[PDB]
Amino acid sequence: MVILENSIQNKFSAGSYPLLWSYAMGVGVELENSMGGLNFGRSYFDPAYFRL
Amino acid sequence: ATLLRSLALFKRNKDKPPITSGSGGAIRGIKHIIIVPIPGDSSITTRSRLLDRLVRLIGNPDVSGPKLTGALIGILSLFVESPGQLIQRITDDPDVSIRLLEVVQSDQSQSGLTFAMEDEADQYFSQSRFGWFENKEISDIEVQDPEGFNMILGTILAQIWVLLAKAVTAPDTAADSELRRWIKYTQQRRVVGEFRLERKWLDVVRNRIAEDLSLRRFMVALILDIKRTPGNKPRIAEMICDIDTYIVEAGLASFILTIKFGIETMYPALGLHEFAGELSTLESLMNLYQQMGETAPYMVILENSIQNKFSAGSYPLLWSYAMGVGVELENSMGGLNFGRSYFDPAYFRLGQEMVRRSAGKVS
Amino acid sequence: ATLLRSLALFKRNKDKPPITSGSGGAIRGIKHIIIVPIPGDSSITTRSRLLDRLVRLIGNPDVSGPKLTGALIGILSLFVESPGQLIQRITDDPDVSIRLLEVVQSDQSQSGLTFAMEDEADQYFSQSRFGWFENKEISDIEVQDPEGFNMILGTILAQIWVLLAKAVTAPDTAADSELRRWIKYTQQRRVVGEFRLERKWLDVVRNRIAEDLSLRRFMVALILDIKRTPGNKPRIAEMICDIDTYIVEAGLASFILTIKFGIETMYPALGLHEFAGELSTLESLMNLYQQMGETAPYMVILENSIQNKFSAGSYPLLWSYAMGVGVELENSMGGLNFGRSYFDPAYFRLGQEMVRRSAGKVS
RNA sequence: ACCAGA
RNA sequence: ACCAGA
RNA sequence: ACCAGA
RNA sequence: ACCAGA
RNA sequence: ACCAGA
């Protein structure tokens, strides 16, 4: 949907769930080495749940 | 227990949309001829010349109400084959009669365009107060390739459709928000980054979309026609339905955020009896929202009479609780202005208190 | 006996860490772009050249606040594969935004390094006031083998991490103590003994670690990341966690030595009633110390607000008793400066008296 | 805030 | 209301 | 929008 | 009516 | 009969 770049990939964006996404980046970068290279820079990050 | 279902039916009739088709036809207003210059002929070249002579028409302090709305309806539908059967397909506005005129290119006219009336077109299309691009080294944006015009028109439309998102809700403080969408369509390679129309061109259009109502009814009702297109949409039309995620529910966030923070979190401060009557007049507004159909996220863009019913004044206590839950959870809710004459901050402080008490307090 | 548990709960709430996550996001300060020159590419050769051009960058009176902190964060993370995903892994400082730039080697540039901006790097990296090694026969420390650079970088880091131990507590009188750790890592064959950076290079860094706070938050929070590494740590990282035993609790020794000498010896002069209230506000500081987690031995290195609570001014009598027990037992406690405006030497002399009375006096 | 700590 | 509190 | 994936 | 939303 | 209600 984002290769075809349709309008419905705005709906799967992490901005609609900005807290539970940051929690999953906190679980994510602590578990795998591979998640350390993922850039997650957004204007809704809220790092208090990333640290949680 | 006969009072309970007699109470719930009482709120499913006074909070019900009125049945229609009772007017025989004596409500229709006095009409108003508007002038929408549609692209002339099959060829790509004249519709790029039409876009060029009609963007700088808008950046002009001498254009009127109808001439500007017809200029915008003229460029918001250049992205289709035969725009004439799109305007009369979309416009069901009762206060505006489309009299749309074909524009063909010429080498006799001054502007380069005649009407299919050779010099009469020059009074239709024609320095520090003319709105134009920010890189004002640009003189003309007339091109001859189809994919060139497809990217220039997609650039001009993508910064007129983002105006609609908060032309009527936050008109003045929309300059910082709409730039963040211009940055979005630049790194997606949707638009070209060079052809950014300036602050003064967009403030003509944003003031126009705010001040008349038949332009918004055209902008809403073609978005609703973009959504119904089943297959792969054309790429400017996909972009309009992509901008649409910022235009939907824009002005209902005293109701959407009341659902998102007051209802869906389910703190123990919803079993208060003072909310128990206001969870039912918010339950009936969720029944009413989905039976209004696909025109329901645009009720304050279209500015109909039913957006007074979704106002937070009908649930002034449970709304304030949800602003208290809201501004304590997100950084983004700190910028929301909620200044109303029914605020009651004792439940706003009760809304913040349920979040702070339930910090590490898994249910 | 209802006053007793009402008293103990009174001291387990005013001496309690405040609950958090109440700020929506409107506390975050104005940011500050810092420049951390990360090593460029997989190859060992450019990160030895980066270390060479960035050690002598620090020994320079013309470097600023941010340029020096970004130089130190640039060299304190050269010991890992891909230092770029370490800086953005560690830094949760709200006052500093890392803008880290890759540095690749070149033969075109003057210094030998460009940015992945060929000559713009030469104004980034560039005699009696340039800080450098004590054996200043050295010109360059660029090497080409991996185990050579692993021992040179381990030598440079082992005398920057020992600066952190008392950069903020005893900054001036740290010159004799930090040499005793340099002697420790020389006979362990951890470092090379030749490459001792001089007094004037380290006094740039020790003054820097003292005067800004976001450098210490990077130095602390990577130490806390070294500890979490489960298996055999890499050998420079093992050395940093080896230096760490001198950095922990550094500035809490009016509290650690109060526990060690006042509490744990258990002389009969703890059943004084004047201490009975101050053994409970020291019991609650031991409950508070272990529920702050792994950031608790660094509370005065990080200089947070909770190290005012572990101060000896809240227990000014039982602390002085423990300085009296302390300086009478060890030779090493004779060098400790305890000069405070709450000393009360009548309990310091009572602290020494319990040691002298209990000389051969097995309990 | 200040000691000693292979 | 009043002290001391890296 | 960004990681890793015989 | 006002926030954030690849 | 009296309020508030983009």
TrEMBL record, chain A:
Subcellular location: Host nucleus; Virion; Host cytoplasm
UniProt family annotation: Belongs to the paramyxoviruses nucleocapsid family.
Function: Forms the helical nucleocapsid (NC), protecting the genome from nucleases. Forms the helical nucleocapsid (NC) in a ratio of 1 N per 6 ribonucleotides, protecting the genome from nucleases. The nucleocapsid (NC) has a helical structure with either 12.35 or 11.64 N per turn, approximately 20 nm in diameter, with a hollow central cavity approximately 5 nm in diameter. The encapsidated genomic RNA serves as template for transcription and replication; encapsidation by N is coupled to RNA synthesis. Forms the encapsidation complex with the phosphoprotein protein P. Before encapsidation, the newly synthesized free N protein, so-called N0, is chaperoned by P.
Subunit structure: Homomultimer; forms the nucleocapsid. Binds to the viral genomic RNA. N0 interacts with the phosphoprotein (via N-terminus); this interaction allows P to chaperon N0 to avoid N polymerization before encapsidation. Interacts as N-RNA template with the phosphoprotein (via C-terminus); this interaction positions the polymerase on the template.
The protein's name: Nucleocapsid
Gene it is expressed from: N
Shown part of the complete sequence: 313 to 364 of 525
